[PDB]
Design a protein around this ligand. Structure first.
Ligand SMILES: *[C@@H]1O[C@H](CO)[C@@H](O[C@@H]2O[C@H](CO)[C@@H](O[C@@H]3O[C@H](CO[C@H]4O[C@H](CO)[C@@H](O)[C@H](O)[C@@H]4O)[C@@H](O)[C@H](O[C@H]4O[C@H](CO)[C@@H](O)[C@H](O)[C@@H]4O)[C@@H]3O)[C@H](O)[C@H]2NC(C)=O)[C@H](O)[C@H]1NC(C)=O
Ligand SMILES: *[C@@H]1O[C@H](CO)[C@@H](O[C@@H]2O[C@H](CO)[C@@H](O[C@@H]3O[C@H](CO)[C@@H](O)[C@H](O[C@H]4O[C@H](CO)[C@@H](O)[C@H](O)[C@@H]4O)[C@@H]3O)[C@H](O)[C@H]2NC(C)=O)[C@H](O)[C@H]1NC(C)=O
Ligand SMILES: *[C@@H]1O[C@H](CO)[C@@H](O[C@@H]2O[C@H](CO)[C@@H](O[C@@H]3O[C@H](CO)[C@@H](O)[C@H](O)[C@@H]3O)[C@H](O)[C@H]2NC(C)=O)[C@H](O)[C@H]1NC(C)=O
Ligand SMILES: *[C@@H]1O[C@H](CO)[C@@H](O[C@@H]2O[C@H](CO)[C@@H](O)[C@H](O)[C@H]2NC(C)=O)[C@H](O)[C@H]1NC(C)=O
Ligand SMILES: *[C@@H]1O[C@H](CO)[C@@H](O[C@@H]2O[C@H](CO)[C@@H](O)[C@H](O)[C@H]2NC(C)=O)[C@H](O)[C@H]1NC(C)=O
Ligand SMILES: *[C@@H]1O[C@H](CO)[C@@H](O[C@@H]2O[C@H](CO)[C@@H](O)[C@H](O)[C@H]2NC(C)=O)[C@H](O)[C@H]1NC(C)=O
Ligand SMILES: *[C@@H]1O[C@H](CO)[C@@H](O)[C@H](O)[C@H]1NC(C)=O
Ligand SMILES: *[C@@H]1O[C@H](CO)[C@@H](O)[C@H](O)[C@H]1NC(C)=O
Ligand SMILES: *[C@@H]1O[C@H](CO)[C@@H](O)[C@H](O)[C@H]1NC(C)=O
Ligand SMILES: *[C@@H]1O[C@H](CO)[C@@H](O)[C@H](O)[C@H]1NC(C)=O
Ligand SMILES: *[C@@H]1O[C@H](CO)[C@@H](O)[C@H](O)[C@H]1NC(C)=O
Ligand SMILES: *[C@@H]1O[C@H](CO)[C@@H](O)[C@H](O)[C@H]1NC(C)=O
Ligand SMILES: *[C@@H]1O[C@H](CO)[C@@H](O)[C@H](O)[C@H]1NC(C)=O
Ligand SMILES: *[C@@H]1O[C@H](CO)[C@@H](O)[C@H](O)[C@H]1NC(C)=O
Ligand SMILES: *[C@@H]1O[C@H](CO)[C@@H](O)[C@H](O)[C@H]1NC(C)=O
Lengths: 474, 481, 483
């Protein structure tokens, strides 16, 4: 008696197909990664910059609460906390603030330098008195660390003309502000000139600012407003500041060195001494799987984000522990014989085919690189909605593609196993023409006596029908 | 002698399906996944009637155009409908700053409360409130003005400095609308407002802007050489907005307290409102369908099937309908797979329930799996762009066209692959059923090869049922030769 | 003993295809769905030559830059070509407001008519039309100015108030270009415009803007501390535009009446224009192909195959190529994919079953055509330009292009792999059914060798063998034990 059957084990893995659901299988692999360390890790051995209680504006402007960020020179990515309220301590509007955040997301490191020294640049203006109650630090009134508030000296504010040439060989980010007093008396008290103008002109940048005086609601106990501006100075370019008052002079500037793969994320996780190639706001991921469902925002080489709850693809056979049954005892291979040993050559071909199938799926799913969210102002809702449609639309398609391929391959994988096991049984039948009775349950009843060597010959494929045709019986 | 045949079901069905290998394959059973029927009427969504602007534009509705007075008493709606002939808006010529952006904000507004932010008689005692009428905005034959705006002009030959503040006590976002008038001539400026160099200042906690009137020769639009620029802002709860002006200010007479919702939008439809309720509304009509796809209109409000460009989406649920195994049995109505009976005691066309029931479950899961994968299309809102936003307009068009091309491709391709697989699935089942009979009838019966079996022995009803039930004892009929 | 065999076709084909289960499978016949060949030349579209700017950009072309005088005679084009070094634009330093948006408008413009909106000698009698030459806009060694703009300065030490209007008689959209000059110092302002405080007003029915000149110390660009800001607008048919200025106005000398078309665009190519006509144009070259996909360039003009990142897209149309069921492929059977071999007394030969082969050929042909039909033709796709304060829009546009390209490349490659595996299994099913058809006819008269061949116990002549291939083989005629 020789039988043909398939493998069975103690495996509770369940898969889904198009025709049937929750099919228990002997072997399977999970294509969805759902585990993360929950910590902010170092990227490329470079620590990320944690803003803490500060936003992007407060960090670059030099907010007094953000002085710990001043001594930072290099980072892999920028982390902002959900309660990042310290920016622009003096009320006002940051022009092109969202655009500046986009520019910094491509900045890997900058060098902070004193573009205009406070004591040397302005001898005819008062560099002191430039402190406000809104920007109070340690109980005392203070001001931005990168900006200087210039006021009248000796009751006179002479015309100011300051120029700077970019000798750093890099893009230079220059920040300045224009102050809008609440009353005409406050204008004369601070700048002596009632009608004043501010001019900032470079080779590629030209803008003039006229202070506006009006009754305004108090924000942080300040009726006045400061409008903050920025520009990028190309190497060799000259920027000229011409003002008769209300100018917030640039005390410090940044020489930018551009990189790739950086971004700005909002995370509630804590930084720990770990290194990863994939970082999410919820935690870092160390996985070679094609898909993940942790967070859509990624930094570095990461699996593609999908909304799928489960993505399990079949790599083995159906687990029927009860050919109408899988032999749990046959642990050597997927296909084999009873009276129980396993046919390695047929199993090895199936293993190679399944391994190539799994590798093809991973090949199709490319690694997702840094994808960071964008910020929009109150008059940019249409772009915000258009950006949201793009993100949701691509996520909608990829979730559909991932789930559909798994179901199709699960049905294809199971049919691959059934066809191979039938061919092995039929191969034996072609070897055994009337020498064995066809029981029909996957077993053969030999009319002759088959020793251990006799059985091995059939498995090897070199079975001689004439040799055991003499013992014709019944 | 006695004969048992094996075949499949056939009926009268003209449904045609397409596969990768062949087209227009007639099948016994099929299901349509594409919805192409709509009522052609504007229906209520969630039992809430939509706001139909009629002959009015969005600007005229919020600004209070005299022709838009029927829309003033509106507080709640499910969605906003705009007519192709909705020309009544900024009746006084001018520019509506961020008009398209304001339209986007209203698409996320489910209901607003209209209140008099500044009472006309109480707020401004030092200015003339009765002279604010223009020929362009004419109502009932007489010159009129916007119902939500107040035109302040010179009173008694004097325009004192104006300072008006409002505190948002409504606990919601407050939409404030105002205008700045730009006269045609300096004489017209002095005649309407005492001060020649005049300014308007509108300042809030998050908003600060100053407007300077410009005087120049302009072509007449609606018989008016002057221009009025309309502005808007959202006042956060508890915030204060201050209006400071020395002239040329169109004061905010009425404001709106906004309540945000989800699923709303602005659509352009020529359909008429009727007393009906629906879960899916399109500019062409409402849809009551559980199908995954529709080809009626891409613009949707509520839970809707996904829009595709497909003309037909038919998925196979049955077998091939080829009459005259060289053909299907039209007489066998009981099931998809079955046998024939020729025992001379009673002939019969019968069906194998166990094989058919297993096939039905597999096909039902296939259709349900496809529908589950295709998510319900939610509210899809069109966007408007000004003449200096063509790049944004074209980028939006690529997104809409690009996604539509892929999903139409996905819908058509998936149907074709499963249609070929379903037909191949049936051929495998009938072959397995044929081998099952052959296995039990290992030697007793002859195999003609045409799907029938020629019995060398006699097979009674008990014998026939035994083969069909699977409990056939070949020894019991093996001696008979 | 007489023998009949069943096998498949083989040839000398080294074409390799990929499936999900196995890679680099050599096949007898295949079709390439990816186009990678182009002529390498800039061709005419619909018999209409493209407009080649050469060393000029869009700004220099429309403004009338002196180096762009060959472009002044342009009336019609199919698309606009820009060279990598098109550095001649806005010779006088300044900012071109909404320059990127103006480029988008021209991408839908098929032809314009250049006309003198305001004649130089007639329009302005109270202002000096000759003093308008600068060193930055120098032609032939002497200072000159834009050919489409007129620099108006004070006449006789006086700049009277200016009011000039134009009514659109062209029945088309009219593109009007003008500039506002910003002097570096107040003395230079008075030297050109006697009035110190001046304003410029441009008002139409759909356009209203006022410009206030700004005077400040500025770095020298092309030896000029002053700046000129260039503006544009589209005048609808029948509309009137009025120019009111007291100084610092760069008057429009020439305007363009636009005739809009579809499918045009602006591309950057280093290729050379040749006397050829094509339906598909790319920056690398023209394409004459009916294939659904191409990997040449994403930028296309006209009807083009969809751009994908795939290196190869080869679909199976034939059998596995195994020269040597049956151990190998029969190179001698050239008539069809499936057929028979036979060894009788009067010779041996390879024949093909036409009825079975034609059904497979038609099925494969329908499969290939169905795939090509699903892949839609890519129409004109042109890149967009963004300024330094539009990085978010630039990045958002980049996400759309990269996101869609990833999906379509995935869709193209995945579909090929699925059908290639299905095609190979489709062929094995047909050859197995052919084997069973012969086996069924030879109930007991033949022995099953097991290698795909049948050994006849009786003598089967040429006519007898044709019956087996024909399907009309009579078992009783040769019902003989022979054992
Ligand atoms: C960095 O970021 C932190 C927040 O993360 C800022 O701290 C906030 O500062 C603002 C402004 O100073 C605070 O807002 C104010 O809250 C006051 C609450 O006072 C009550 O509660 C305190 C609790 O300690 C009691 O001691 C006190 O007696 C009161 O019972 C309000 O009274 C304030 O109103 C004032 O301003 C408004 C606006 O102008 C006026 O209209 C009012 O009339 C009044 O003058 C104001 O609302 C906020 O509470 C602070 N938060 C925290 C957690 O401390 C830092 O200031 C910021 N620093 C920098 C440099 O940016
Ligand atoms: C059409 O485009 C071509 C370039 O494709 C352009 O030719 C270029 O013109 C500029 C300006 O005339 C040249 O740049 C100058 O070159 C001289 C040396 O020959 C330098 O001395 C100049 O530097 C001085 O000026 C600067 C600006 O004030 C100062 O900052 C500096 O300190 C110096 O004082 C300046 O670099 C350039 O060399 C040519 N290039 C070529 C290849 O000819 C042409 O003018 C354009 N024509 C039109 C009508 O637009
Ligand atoms: C609301 O919209 C309607 C449009 O349906 C406005 O009516 C239109 O008003 C303009 C006013 O300039 C009319 O133009 C003029 O028509 C007369 C002939 O009646 C002609 O002599 C003039 O030279 C000029 O062309 C326009 O014809 C008219 N159209 C219709 C259909 O009535 C109405 O004024 C708008 N009301 C408000 C408050 O916005
Ligand atoms: C800048 O302005 C401040 C205003 O407070 C000056 O501070 C005062 O300076 C005068 C002159 O030395 C003293 O008499 C006052 O006692 C100072 N008061 C305070 C509170 O500082 C400051 O000196 C000015 N600096 C310059 C360089 O003029
Ligand atoms: C036109 O030629 C320019 C070079 O003058 C090409 O720009 C270079 O392309 C190579 C890759 O092909 C890059 O490595 C260089 O960085 C590019 N910039 C240079 C050399 O300045 C440009 O790609 C060509 N245009 C087309 C359409 O092929
Ligand atoms: C595009 O390719 C097609 C096919 O290769 C060309 O059409 C053939 O041209 C040759 C030479 O004139 C003729 O002998 C054939 O009869 C043509 N075949 C067909 C189907 O038209 C066509 O000329 C090419 N077009 C261009 C612009 O190069
Ligand atoms: C399944 O069997 C394996 C045999 O290697 C054993 O290690 C494992 O603990 C078993 N699992 C369960 C859940 O019984
Ligand atoms: C088709 O079948 C239905 C169901 O029995 C029947 O009502 C109808 O008359 C039939 N018509 C034809 C043309 O077969
Ligand atoms: C399939 O049938 C439809 C409906 O009659 C017809 O329009 C179409 O041309 C047919 N297709 C083929 C390939 O016969
Ligand atoms: C406004 O002015 C008109 C004259 O144009 C006058 O009849 C009217 O009484 C004035 N109203 C007020 C409140 O002064
Ligand atoms: C939608 O159609 C179904 C069809 O059976 C019907 O029962 C249901 O009442 C319909 N719903 C509405 C709101 O018309
Ligand atoms: C195969 O031989 C034929 C002989 O005509 C030749 O045309 C063809 O190019 C050859 N193919 C290969 C791949 O060698
Ligand atoms: C298939 O051939 C290509 C090209 O020679 C090669 O890069 C690839 O590794 C090959 N694949 C296998 C599985 O041999
Ligand atoms: C314009 O200015 C030039 C330069 O001084 C002078 O030669 C010419 O005569 C002037 N023309 C008029 C009409 O004033
Ligand atoms: C083969 O079949 C054809 C019909 O297709 C018939 O005309 C011919 O006589 C047959 N030949 C033989 C040898 O049976």
């Amino acid at each position: 008696t020789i039988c043909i059957g398939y493998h069975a084990n103690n495996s509770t893995d369940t898969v889904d197909t198009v025709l049937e659901k929750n099919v228990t299988v002997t072997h399977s692999v999970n294509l969805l990664e759902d585990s993360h360390n929950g910590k902010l890790c170092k990227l490329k051995g470079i620590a990320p910059l944690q803003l803490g209680k500060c936003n992007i504006a407060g960090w670059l402007l030099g907010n007094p609460e953000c002085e710990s960020l001043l001594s930072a020179r290099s980072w892999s990515y920028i982390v902002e906390t959900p309660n990042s309220e310290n920016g622009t301590c003096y009320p006002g509007d940051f022009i092109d603030y969202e655009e500046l955040r986009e520019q910094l997301s491509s900045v890997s490191s900058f060098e902070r330098f004193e573009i205009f020294p406070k004591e040397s640049s302005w001898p005819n203006h008062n560099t002191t008195k430039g402190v406000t109650a809104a920007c109070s630090h340690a109980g005392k009134s203070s001001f931005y660390r990168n900006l200087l508030w210039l006021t009248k000296k000796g009751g006179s504010y002479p015309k100011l003309s300051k120029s700077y040439v970019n000798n750093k060989g890099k893009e230079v980010l220059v920040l300045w502000g224009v102050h809008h007093p609440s009353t005409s008396t406050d204008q004369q008290s601070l700048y002596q000139n009632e009608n004043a103008y501010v001019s900032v002109v470079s080779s590629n940048y030209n803008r003039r600012f006229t202070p506006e005086i009006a009754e305004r609601p108090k924000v942080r106990g300040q009726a006045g407003r400061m409008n903050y501006y920025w520009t990028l100075l190309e190497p060799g370019d000259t920027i000229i500041f011409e003002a008769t008052g209300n100018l917030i002079a640039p005390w410090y500037a940044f020489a930018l060195s551009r990189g790739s793969g950086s971004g700005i994320i909002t995370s509630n996780a804590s930084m720990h001494e770990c290194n990863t190639k994939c970082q999410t706001p919820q935690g870092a991921i160390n996985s070679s799987l094609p898909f993940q469902n942790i967070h859509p925002v990624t930094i570095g080489e990461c699996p593609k984000y999908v909304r799928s709850t489960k993505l399990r693809m079949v790599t083995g056979l159906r687990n029927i522990p009860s050919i109408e049954g899988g032999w749990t005892g046959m642990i050597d291979g997927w296909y084999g014989y009873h009276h129980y040993a396993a046919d390695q050559k047929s199993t090895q071909n199936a293993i190679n085919g399944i391994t190539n199938k799994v590798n093809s799926v991973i090949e199709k799913m490319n690694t997702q690189f840094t994808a960071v969210g964008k910020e929009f102002n109150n008059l940019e809702k249409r772009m915000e909605n258009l950006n949201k449609k793009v993100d949701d639309g691509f996520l909608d398609i990829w979730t559909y593609n991932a789930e559909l391929l798994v179901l199709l391959e699960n049905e294809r994988t199971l049919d691959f196993h059934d066809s191979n096991v039938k061919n092995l049984y039929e191969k034996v039948k072609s070897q055994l023409r009337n020498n064995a009775k066809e029981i029909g349950n996957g077993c053969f009843e030999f009319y002759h006596k088959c020793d251990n060597e006799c059985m091995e010959s059939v498995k090897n494929g070199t079975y001689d029908y004439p040799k055991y045709s003499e013992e014709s019986k019944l």
